[PDB]
Amino acid sequence: HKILHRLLQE
Amino acid sequence: RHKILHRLLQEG
Amino acid sequence: PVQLSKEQEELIRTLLGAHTRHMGTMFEQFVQFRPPAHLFIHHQPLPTLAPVLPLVTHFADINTFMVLQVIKFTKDLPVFRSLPIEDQISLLKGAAVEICHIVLNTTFCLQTQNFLCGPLRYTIEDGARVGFQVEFLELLFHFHGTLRKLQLQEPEYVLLAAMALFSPDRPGVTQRDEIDQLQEEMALTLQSYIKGQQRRPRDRFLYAKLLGLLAELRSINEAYGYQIQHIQGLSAMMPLLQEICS
Amino acid sequence: NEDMPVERILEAELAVEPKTETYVEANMGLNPSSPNDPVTNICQAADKQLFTLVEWAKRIPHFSELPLDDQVILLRAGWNELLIASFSHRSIAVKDGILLATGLHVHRNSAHSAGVGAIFDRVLTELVSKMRDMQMDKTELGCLRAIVLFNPDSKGLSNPAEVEALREKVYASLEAYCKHKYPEQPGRFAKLLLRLPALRSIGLKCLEHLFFFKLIGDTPIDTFLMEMLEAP
Numbered sequence A: 001h002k003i004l005h006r007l008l009q010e
Numbered sequence B: 001r002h003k004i005l006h007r008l009l010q011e012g
Numbered sequence C: 001p002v003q004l005s006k007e008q009e010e011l012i013r014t015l016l017g018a019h020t021r022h023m024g025t026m027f028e029q030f031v032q033f034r035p036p037a038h039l040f041i042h043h044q045p046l047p048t049l050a051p052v053l054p055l056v057t058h059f060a061d062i063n064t065f066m067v068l069q070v071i072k073f074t075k076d077l078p079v080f081r082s083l084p085i086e087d088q089i090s091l092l093k094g095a096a097v098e099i100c101h102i103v104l105n106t107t108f109c110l111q112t113q114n115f116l117c118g119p120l121r122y123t124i125e126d127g128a129r130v131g132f133q134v135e136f137l138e139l140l141f142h143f144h145g146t147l148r149k150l151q152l153q154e155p156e157y158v159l160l161a162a163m164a165l166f167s168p169d170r171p172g173v174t175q176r177d178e179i180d181q182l183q184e185e186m187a188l189t190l191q192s193y194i195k196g197q198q199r200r201p202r203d204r205f206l207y208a209k210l211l212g213l214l215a216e217l218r219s220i221n222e223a224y225g226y227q228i229q230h231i232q233g234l235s236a237m238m239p240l241l242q243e244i245c246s
Numbered sequence D: 001n002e003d004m005p006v007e008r009i010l011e012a013e014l015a016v017e018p019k020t021e022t023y024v025e026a027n028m029g030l031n032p033s034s035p036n037d038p039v040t041n042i043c044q045a046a047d048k049q050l051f052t053l054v055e056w057a058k059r060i061p062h063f064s065e066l067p068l069d070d071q072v073i074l075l076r077a078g079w080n081e082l083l084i085a086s087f088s089h090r091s092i093a094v095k096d097g098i099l100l101a102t103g104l105h106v107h108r109n110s111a112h113s114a115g116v117g118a119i120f121d122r123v124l125t126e127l128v129s130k131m132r133d134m135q136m137d138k139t140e141l142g143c144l145r146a147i148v149l150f151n152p153d154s155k156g157l158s159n160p161a162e163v164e165a166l167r168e169k170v171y172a173s174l175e176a177y178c179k180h181k182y183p184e185q186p187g188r189f190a191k192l193l194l195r196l197p198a199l200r201s202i203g204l205k206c207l208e209h210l211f212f213f214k215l216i217g218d219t220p221i222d223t224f225l226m227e228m229l230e231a232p
C-alpha cells in the first residue's frame, strides 16, 4: 500500500 | 422466477 | 427503567408467539437430519481422511430447514402477511440469512466457541471442512463472540430479528413507506426495553452497538451468498437458499 | 464525556470541505470521452476525496495516537462508507441530484442513462432523503463519519479493545450533543444511528460497481482509489 502509508506519515 | 418462495408464502 | 406502552407490550407478545412456535427450539431438531457421528462425539473432529459428503448433506439439510422455520415464523405475523408478496419475498431474500445467525447465536457457547444445538456441537473446522473459505468463518465466528457477549434476554433477541427483517432499503421493496415506518417502529420499541434494564450486567450503548451488528449482519448476508456459489455444487444442494441469495 | 470534543469533530469536517463551492452539470454520459462522463467523474472525485479523507481522519480526536497500522486498517476498510456519507449529506442541498467533490452535479437522469440508476436511487432514498427529513448537522455527520472510522471489528486489528474504546467515547459525545442541542426530540441520538445498517449495504453494493469498472469497464481508475480496492 504505497500511497496510503506516505500520507498517514507526513 | 423465485418458484419455491412464491410457493412457500402461499398459505399455512 | 422506562415504560413500554400498551402497543409495545403486545408487539413483543406476538413476536414470541410465532418465534417459540417455529424457531428457538428448532435447534433440538437438527439431530434428525442424519447428523454425522463426530457431531455427537464432540471429543474429536472428522477423521483426517473420512468422506466429507455425509456432513455436507447435513449442512445443506439444516440450512434449508432453518430458512424454512424463519419463513414459518414470518407467516405468523399480521403485519408481514399484510405486505404484498413482492415485498415479503424481498424482505425474506434480504433478511432470512441474517435472521438465522441472530437466532443461532443463542446456542453459541462462549467458553468452547461451539454451537451446542441440543446434543450436537458444531465447531469452526466443521464449516471449514464443508468448504467455507477461512476468513468468512473467522469473520462469522467473531460476530457471534461479540453478539453473545452482550447478553441479550430472549425478548432483546426477538426484536433484533424483527429489525433485520423490516428493512426498507432492501432491493425489491415496493411499500418502502410502510416498511420504513415498521422499521422506525421496531427500532423504537427496542430502545425502550434496553433502557429498562433491570440488571445492568450489560453495556450502556447496547442498542448503538447492536446496529453496528445489524450492519455487520449485512456484510454477512452478502459474504455468505458469495460462499455458497464459490463452493462447487453446494448452492445446488439447498435450492431454497439459492433463491434467498438470488 | 469531554475527552472527545465535538468542536474538534465539526472543525475537522469544516477543514475538509472546499472553500470554493461552484457546480456544473454532467452530460448524459453516453461516451467515456466527454469531460462529463458520469461513471468516470465519480472515480475522479473519489480519488480526490480519498486524499482529503486521510486528513479528515487525522483531524479526528485521537486517531493520530493509534498505531500506524491500526490507522491504515481502519481507513483501508472504511474509506468507502466514509466518502459515501460525506457526499450524501453534502447533496441534501438539491433534489434528485448528487453534488460531487469535483464540483459537478449529477442528475438522477444521467444516472439511469449511464446504467447505475438503481444504486443512485438507493442513496437518495436511504441516505440523502433520510438526512434531510431529520436535519442532521455537519457535527452529527462528523460523529457518524467518525464511528465508521472506529470499527473495532476490523480484521487484523492489533487492539480491538482499544479501538472499541474510542467508539464508545463518541457514542457519549454524540448522544450528548443530541439530547443537548435537540431536547424536544429525545430519541434523536438513535434516529441518527438507524442509517448505519443502510450505509453498510449501500457501501457494499457500491464496491461491486467499483470492482466492475476495474475488471471490465474501460473506465479510467486512478492511483489512491485503485489501491483501496483489492478483494476478489
Ligand SMILES: CCCCCCCCCCCCCCC(=O)O
Residues within 6 Å of the ligand: D042, D045, D046, D049, D080, D083, D084, D086, D087, D098, D099, D100, D101, D102, D116, D119, D120, D123, D206, D207, D209, D210
Ligand atoms: C451514486 C453513484 C453510485 C454508483 C457508482 C460507484 C460508487 C462508489 C464511489 C464512492 C464515492 C466517491 C464519492 C466522492 C465525493 O465525496 O464527492
